[PDB]
Amino acid sequence: GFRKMAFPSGKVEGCMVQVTCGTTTLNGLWLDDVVYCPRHVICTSEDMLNPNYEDLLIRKSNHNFLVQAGNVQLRVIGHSMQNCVLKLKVDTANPKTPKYKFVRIQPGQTFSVLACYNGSPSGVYQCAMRPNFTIKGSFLNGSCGSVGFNIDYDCVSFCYMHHMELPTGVHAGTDLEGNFYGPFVDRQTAQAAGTDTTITVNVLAWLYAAVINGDRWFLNRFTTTLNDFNLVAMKYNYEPLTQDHVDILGPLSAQTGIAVLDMCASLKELLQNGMNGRTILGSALLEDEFTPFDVVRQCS
Amino acid sequence: SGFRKMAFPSGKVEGCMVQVTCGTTTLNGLWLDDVVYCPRHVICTSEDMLNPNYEDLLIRKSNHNFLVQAGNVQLRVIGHSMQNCVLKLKVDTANPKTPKYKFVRIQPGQTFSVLACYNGSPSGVYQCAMRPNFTIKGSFLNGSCGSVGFNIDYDCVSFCYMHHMELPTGVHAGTDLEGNFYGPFVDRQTAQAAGTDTTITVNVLAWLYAAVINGDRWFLNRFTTTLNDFNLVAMKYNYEPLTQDHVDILGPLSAQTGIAVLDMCASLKELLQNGMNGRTILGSALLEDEFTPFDVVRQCS
Numbered sequence: 001g002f003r004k005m006a007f008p009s010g011k012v013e014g015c016m017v018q019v020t021c022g023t024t025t026l027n028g029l030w031l032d033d034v035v036y037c038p039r040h041v042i043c044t045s046e047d048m049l050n051p052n053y054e055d056l057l058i059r060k061s062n063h064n065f066l067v068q069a070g071n072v073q074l075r076v077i078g079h080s081m082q083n084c085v086l087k088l089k090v091d092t093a094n095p096k097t098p099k100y101k102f103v104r105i106q107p108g109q110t111f112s113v114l115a116c117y118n119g120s121p122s123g124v125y126q127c128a129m130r131p132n133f134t135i136k137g138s139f140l141n142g143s144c145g146s147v148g149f150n151i152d153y154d155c156v157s158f159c160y161m162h163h164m165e166l167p168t169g170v171h172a173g174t175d176l177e178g179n180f181y182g183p184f185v186d187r188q189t190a191q192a193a194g195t196d197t198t199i200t201v202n203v204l205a206w207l208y209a210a211v212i213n214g215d216r217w218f219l220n221r222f223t224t225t226l227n228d229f230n231l232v233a234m235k236y237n238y239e240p241l242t243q244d245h246v247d248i249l250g251p252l253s254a255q256t257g258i259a260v261l262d263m264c265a266s267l268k269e270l271l272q273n274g275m276n277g278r279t280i281l282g283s284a285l286l287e288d289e290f291t292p293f294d295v296v297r298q299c300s
Numbered sequence: 301s302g303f304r305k306m307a308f309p310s311g312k313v314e315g316c317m318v319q320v321t322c323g324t325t326t327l328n329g330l331w332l333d334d335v336v337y338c339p340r341h342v343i344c345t346s347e348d349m350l351n352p353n354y355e356d357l358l359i360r361k362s363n364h365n366f367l368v369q370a371g372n373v374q375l376r377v378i379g380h381s382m383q384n385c386v387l388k389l390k391v392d393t394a395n396p397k398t399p400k401y402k403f404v405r406i407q408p409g410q411t412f413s414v415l416a417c418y419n420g421s422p423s424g425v426y427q428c429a430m431r432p433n434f435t436i437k438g439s440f441l442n443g444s445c446g447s448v449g450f451n452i453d454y455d456c457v458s459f460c461y462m463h464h465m466e467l468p469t470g471v472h473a474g475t476d477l478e479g480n481f482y483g484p485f486v487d488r489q490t491a492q493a494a495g496t497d498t499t500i501t502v503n504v505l506a507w508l509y510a511a512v513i514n515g516d517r518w519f520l521n522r523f524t525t526t527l528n529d530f531n532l533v534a535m536k537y538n539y540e541p542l543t544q545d546h547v548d549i550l551g552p553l554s555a556q557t558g559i560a561v562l563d564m565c566a567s568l569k570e571l572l573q574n575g576m577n578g579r580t581i582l583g584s585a586l587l588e589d590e591f592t593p594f595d596v597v598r599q600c601s
């Protein structure tokens with residue numbers, strides 16, 4: 001009925017390059033005449049534990065950076081660091097640059113990842129930002145600098161640049177302005193992700209999806225306030241809803257004629273009483289990685 | 301390192317998608333060199349769709365009845381022919397974005413990436429498997445007809461699927477790029493059922509190996525089984541036979557994890573007989589069968 005679908009990756013494939021400093025190598029993003037990549041590339045192995053990035057960078061010049069589009073070198077003509085990203089100005093404007101923007105997403109929002117190795121795209125999949133600001137991605141060694149994105153009409157919104165894998169196997173990274181999602185830093189030390197929670201807004205979208213498809217046994221004749229719902233949800237390790245979350249459920253609410261706070265009351269009964277041997281959309285688990293926009297993308 | 305359904309990057313296929321229109325009937329086509337491939341269903345009017353005689357319908361068309369649009373550019377059609385359920389429209393301009401490619405017919409259990417398109421415009425990409433009953437469990441809406449499935453090796457696109465229709469059960473049926481259906485289906489708007497489906501055993505075993513590689517091992521045991529005794533239980537539960545070639549293909553994953561293939565079989569046997577008891581594997585409550593051994597090797601190594 002529903003599966004993770006990625007955006008077509010072509011517009012992003014044409015922007016992927018490789019960046020190397022010494023033997024340190026990773027992926028970068030070539031837009032107009034700038035290449036963006038994790039500043040970790042300037043680290044030697046001995047720097048990686050506890051880098052002084054200001055110190056490392058002032059010892060670099062343009063001629064120390066090898067940027068390659070496949071095997072074609074792009075000459076670097078300027079360099080700077082913005083938070084945890086390196087910005088290399090190159091002498092060639094990428095002719096495959098799409099219309100684009102840089103956005104910072106919230107937990108629960110989904111995006112497509114183009115996993116790349118040595119500047120070469122390998123695979124594309126959808127994933128969600130967890131409430132603890134990690135992603136349950138699929139990434140091997142060499143994936144650093146792979147990007148996440150959404151496409152809205154002809155415009156690519158880049159939201160994620162991959163930096164590191166955490167001890168538990170989840171992934172951490174930054175926006176394209178180099179600000180980390182979550183309390184992580186770009187050093188090769190063990191950092192733990194905070195306890196994760198269930199993405200309530202996406203579970204509600206999934207219940208709407210089930211209603212659209214005629215599976216609606218869980219609808220009740222009760223309602224709740226948002227505040228009371230939020231207080232109860234927290235006791236089952238569910239995220240509180242924001243005003244923005246209520247608003248993004250508006251289209252599904254309209255399509256089904258089920259008020260958001262009535263769906264909240266339905267979810268509240270499921271939390272308190274369980275599924276009691278029943279399934280929703282053929283599954284005993286509530287899915288939390290499909291957004292309201294994903295549901296309308298796939299149903300309509 | 302993680303485990304997700306992962307598609308091939310779609311860009312090489314995106315640059316080949318076009319819109320084809322015949323009268324008011326419209327769908328997607330695939331532009332390679334100077335030929336556009338699309339479902340022959342596009343030659344049908346509404347009334348034709350229910351019970352078409354395609355040789356008759358085609359003889360009654362000429363080149364100028366076909367409108368091919370690549371974005372807003374119209375490609376002039378200078379020839380037409382039909383190969384089984386695929387129409388081939390020769391156009392007067394070569395597609396410069398044509399990748400290295402081949403046409404391949406896949407076997408049940410093999411996986412591929414789908415590029416879902418609408419009105420010639422790519423919409424989404426995801427991974428599917430050819431089911432044992434020759435359906436696919438896709439994600440397709442009205443207007444997806446002509447979307448293609450493919451695999452990429454190095455720089456060469458192997459096209460294996462052209463989407464035609466959705467069955468009443470909500471699964472999907474289509475052809476290879478020589479226009480032959482997968483399965484007992486026909487390109488007519490009439491209700492069609494598939495054969496009873498079965499589970500792709502070698503793929504379930506591949507996925508259990510992925511689970512072990514990613515640290516989820518609760519289901520392992522030390523029952524031992526023979527291939528033959530595993531196959532008897534598999535058959536009983538509507539699972540496809542596991543062959544010695546399948547065992548061979550799982551060898552690299554067995555070596556990596558230290559778990560013999562027949563020991564993984566013993567684990568699967570117990571899962572079938574006992575269930576998962578509300579536990580999950582790689583976050584799934586069900587035994588996943590749409591990852592091949594090659595898929596697992598590629599994503600885990």
Ligand SMILES: CCCCCn1cc2cc(Nc3cc(=O)n(Cc4ncn(C)n4)c(=O)n3Cc3cc(F)c(F)cc3F)c(Cl)cc2n1
Binds near residue numbers: 165301
């Ligand atoms: C040809 C042979 C290597 C050429 C020489 N060399 C070695 C290197 C090692 C590196 N390190 C990492 C690469 C990498 O892909 N991933 C991601 C990933 N995600 C799933 N996994 C398993 N790993 C990753 O976590 N790291 C660690 C890491 C990255 C960060 F940015 C950071 F702030 C903190 C860190 F601890 C990097 Cl960035 C470059 C390299 N060059």
Ligand SMILES: CCCCCn1cc2cc(Nc3cc(=O)n(Cc4ncn(C)n4)c(=O)n3Cc3cc(F)c(F)cc3F)c(Cl)cc2n1
Binds near residue numbers: 324326490
């Ligand atoms: C633009 C404004 C005027 C549009 C005028 N118009 C109407 C049309 C209807 C059509 N039909 C279908 C389109 C379609 O996308 N899918 C796929 C899909 N997959 C998930 N779903 C739900 N449907 C699909 O099953 N069909 C049915 C079908 C297709 C076959 F090839 C076939 F042999 C037998 C069939 F019954 C077609 Cl092909 C062209 C059309 N043009």
